[PDB]
Amino acid sequence: GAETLPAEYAGGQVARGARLGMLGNADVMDAPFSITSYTARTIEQQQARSVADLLQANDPSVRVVGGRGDLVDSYTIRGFSVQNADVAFNGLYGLLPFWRVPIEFAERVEVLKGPNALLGGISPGGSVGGTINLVPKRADDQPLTRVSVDWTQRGQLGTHLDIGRRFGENNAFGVRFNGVYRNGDTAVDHQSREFPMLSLGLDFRGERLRLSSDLLYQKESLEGVVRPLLTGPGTTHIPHAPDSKTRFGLRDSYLDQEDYSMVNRGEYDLADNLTAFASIGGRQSNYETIAANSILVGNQGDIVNSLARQRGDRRTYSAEVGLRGNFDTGPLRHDWTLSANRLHERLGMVYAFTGMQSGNLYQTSPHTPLPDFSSLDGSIPKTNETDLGGVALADRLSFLEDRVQVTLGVRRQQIESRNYDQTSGARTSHDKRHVWTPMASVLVKPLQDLSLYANYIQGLSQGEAAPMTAANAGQVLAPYKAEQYEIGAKYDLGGFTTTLALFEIRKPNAYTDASNVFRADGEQRNRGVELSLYGEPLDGVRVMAGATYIKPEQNKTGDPASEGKDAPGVARRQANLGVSWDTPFVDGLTLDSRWIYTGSAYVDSANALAVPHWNRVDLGAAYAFQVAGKPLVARANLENALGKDYWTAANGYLSISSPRTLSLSLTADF
């Protein structure tokens, strides 16, 4: 079925399938895309708390910007940015915590590489690099009464309860609750963090009727907020990264960020070859912050911290309804889906940038003045209203005993947004557009264990508004249509799988031309190769490895200083290697190592500002034992074991590494 949880692959660290938006779940070997799905077991073994913790440690395609000391994580995938706000939830946008998705309630975290507008519609944030999808935990038949306690340097103490029960005839009903409370000093100087999280996953499985409800509350409170380093007009070189414990932004920064959501989902089998489905959900997101971005001034590490207060009240609704069925026109099977989706959001987002305070990269900042930001006090006005709605039709044509599979789709995507000035309430912009966006794929299975494939699909982003500097200040540009071609090969030898893919993604870029009109006449052309190996090649020895190579060409810019140069914040080379080993010499003892590599990259489109490659090494240990009939597992995670300090490049800015960080936990099942 479309919604059946894909089984775990050999080794239990990844799964055998993942969601393809409106098409539902597909096995890796029947997906004409590059998909990876990480399991709860991998989450729990690595003591990963966020999407970022997980993807950075394991995935060769994903690299994190911001990091855990910052209020936000973003992701780069196939040399494009992917916003945390663009992470899906069972294939739906707008329902997960806006700045940073927690994963201690997740059964899977999945990554579909490359744009996928046909499959899911436009992402709220306009991301086209790839779609990250979280699958919520459900209650298993066996009852779960799990408690764990944890410690993370320097003094964060936590507790996590995971309780599940199924009930009724044939265990038709499921209830799974997760609660976390984690609090205390982080690894970084003068920083502390509080984190409460509550989730519930509720399901009913009947004969023809399948229902679920997911609820989530979370809050992230920071005392001390790490922020990026911006390049300044005459930066000529990027200083060497400081000790990752140093905190060189605003000493008395804070964040309070709260997200909560609910989504209800259903299917009903109207006949043996016809199923209706729908989902309705929404999200409230409350944001309060004072912090500062650090700006490079000169070239020996001096900075200026540019202070801001930001307050946000964000209210999102997200829904889908559709039909899927199947028929035969002779030797050909049709598996068709007709879907319609809607995201509606009202946001108030106010800010004021006041304060410029001198600091240094190599120094943890002292207490400094907090400007008077009381002009943002009171109720937060509406600053934006957005409505994204689409209708799609797809058909997977299966031929020759399902060994050839041709998928075609088209979607009509509507976009509408209105903006209002934060001070005056004046209507500033109103964008209303539509785009038709198709896909086509083919997959052939020469062997049971070998799949070859090609796809074409697009990605959409809402057009930018012209900066106030420009001749066309305020004017909203047309949507950016990204286009992907990909081919690849997947080979499953039973215990492990190797994949290869080649892609290209072309996308318009906007810039201010030499006559001060902001135009989307730029083109980026990202072409790359991806290689992966995963599974359990020997008994008790699990491996996840991979490497990418990408040429992220700014193939059209006008400006000769940048033309045909590399897009900033996009390393050409990346790789990961992870090994998890059950020691045959001690019962219950498993040892993990990981190596993460990121090649050199640039911060600027002229490519005068390069930042070096980097390496991180992680070490883990888990020890499973019994006490009084009950299973316990003690774990250790050592992230960045070598204590390396490194910049991650982005476009016009960089984010500092986290320090060497030890986590310990004990888990008990009752």
Ligand X SMILES: CCCCCCCCOCCOCCOCCOCCO
Quick note: the x/- pattern for K ion over 367-406, rule CB under 5 A, is: ----------------xx----------------------
Q: Distance between CA 555 and CA 567 in Å, rounded?
A: 9
| DSSP sequence for 564-611 | T-BPTT--SEEEEEEEEEE-TTSTTEEEEEEEEEE--EESSTTS--EE
Of residues 279, 288, 267, the one with CA closest to residue 317 = 279
Of the residues 9, 38, 99, 177, which one makes contact with ligand X according to CB under 6 A: 177
- Judged by CB under 6 A, the residue of 125, 282, 488, 569 near ligand X is 282
- Using alpha carbons, select from 93, 77, 69 the residue that is nearest to residue 225: 69
- 108 binds ligand X, rule: CB under 6 A: no
d(CA 10, CA 39): 12
Q: Which does 601 bind (CB under 5 to 8 A by kind): K ion, ligand X, none?
A: K ion
CA 183 to chain centre: 24
CB 591, min distance to ligand X, A: 9
Compute CA distances 109 → 6, 49, 141, whole Å: 12, 12, 22
| Residue closest to ligand X when measured from CB atoms | 282
Binding segment for ligand X (CB under 6 A), chosen from 376-384, 441-449, 565-573, 632-640, is 632-640
Contact status: 146 vs ligand X (CB under 6 A)? no
Amino acid identity of residue 418, one-letter, is R
Of 73, 464, 429, the closest CA to residue 257 belongs to 73
DSSP 8-state secondary structure symbol assigned to residue 169: G
| Contact criterion met (CB below 8 Å) for 665 and 149 | yes
Among 74, 294, 665, 667, binds ligand X (CB under 6 A): 665
Residue 476 CB, shortest distance to ligand X, in Å, is 26
Work out which of 147, 198, 547, 575 binds ligand X, going by CB under 6 A.
198
Among 199, 294, 357, 665, binds K ion (CB under 5 A): 665
- Confirm or reject binding of residue 636 to ligand X (CB under 6 A): yes
Q: Give the number of other Cβ atoms within 10 Å of residue 428's Cβ.
A: 16
In terms of Cα–Cα distance, which of 208, 364, 200, 372 is closest to 294?
364
Q: Which stretch binds ligand X (CB under 6 A): 261-269, 349-357, 469-477, 487-495?
A: 261-269
Site residues for ligand X, 294-323, by CB under 6 A, read 315, 317
Interface segment toward K ion; rule CB under 5 A; list 164-172, 206-214, 402-410, 570-578: 570-578
Among 26, 29, 135, 296, which residue interacts with K ion (rule: CB under 5 A)?
Answer: 135
Does 491 contact ligand X by CB under 6 A?
Answer: no
Residue 220 or residue 530: which is nearer to ligand X going by CB? 220
Residue 175 contact partner, candidates K ion, ligand X, none, CB within 5 to 8 A by sort of partner: ligand X
Interface size with ligand X, residues (CB under 6 A): 36
Which residues between 597 and 616 bind K ion (CB under 5 A)? 601
Q: Are 100 and 73 in contact (CB under 8 A)?
A: yes
Give the C-alpha distances (Å, rounded to integers) separating 83 from 64, 97, 286, 343, 639. Answer: 10, 12, 18, 16, 24
Scored b (16 or more CB within 10 A) or e, 275-295 reads: bebebbbbbebbbbbbbbbbb
Decide: 89 and 96 in contact? Cβ < 8 Å: yes
Stretch near ligand X under the rule CB under 6 A, chosen from 26-34, 173-181, 369-377, 520-528: 173-181
**Least gap, CB of 319 to ligand X (angstroms):** 8
Closest distance to ligand X from the beta carbon of 323 (Å): 14
- In the chain, the amino acid numbered 114 is G
Quick one: 96 or 443, whose CB is closer to ligand X? 96
User: Does 149 sit near ligand X (CB under 6 A)?
Assistant: yes
- Rounded CA gap, 500 and 485, in Å? 14
578 binds, among K ion, ligand X, none (CB under 5 to 8 A by kind): K ion
Phi first, then psi, for residue 215 (nearest 5°) are: -125, 145
**CB of 320: closest distance to ligand X in angstroms?**
10
Question: Which of these segments, 367-375, 399-407, 497-505, 634-642, binds ligand X (CB under 6 A)?
Answer: 634-642
Judged by beta carbon, residue 100 or residue 660, the one nearer K ion is: 100
Specify whether the CB–CB gap between 95 and 101 falls below 8 A: no
Q: Output the smallest distance, CB 327 to K ion, in A.
A: 25
Q: Is 95 in the site for ligand X (CB under 6 A)?
A: no
Please name every residue paired with 112 in a beta bridge, in sequence order, or none if there are none. 35, 131
What are the structure tokens assigned to 597, written together?
């590599």
**What are the residues binding K ion (CB under 5 A)?**
19, 25, 58, 65, 74, 85, 122-123, 125-126, 135, 148, 150, 160, 383-384, 419, 462, 544, 566, 572, 576, 578, 601, 665
Chain residues that interact with ligand X, rule: CB under 6 A: 149-151, 157, 163, 165, 175, 177, 179, 198, 200, 211, 215-217, 260-262, 264-266, 278, 280-282, 284, 315, 317, 621, 623, 634-636, 664-666
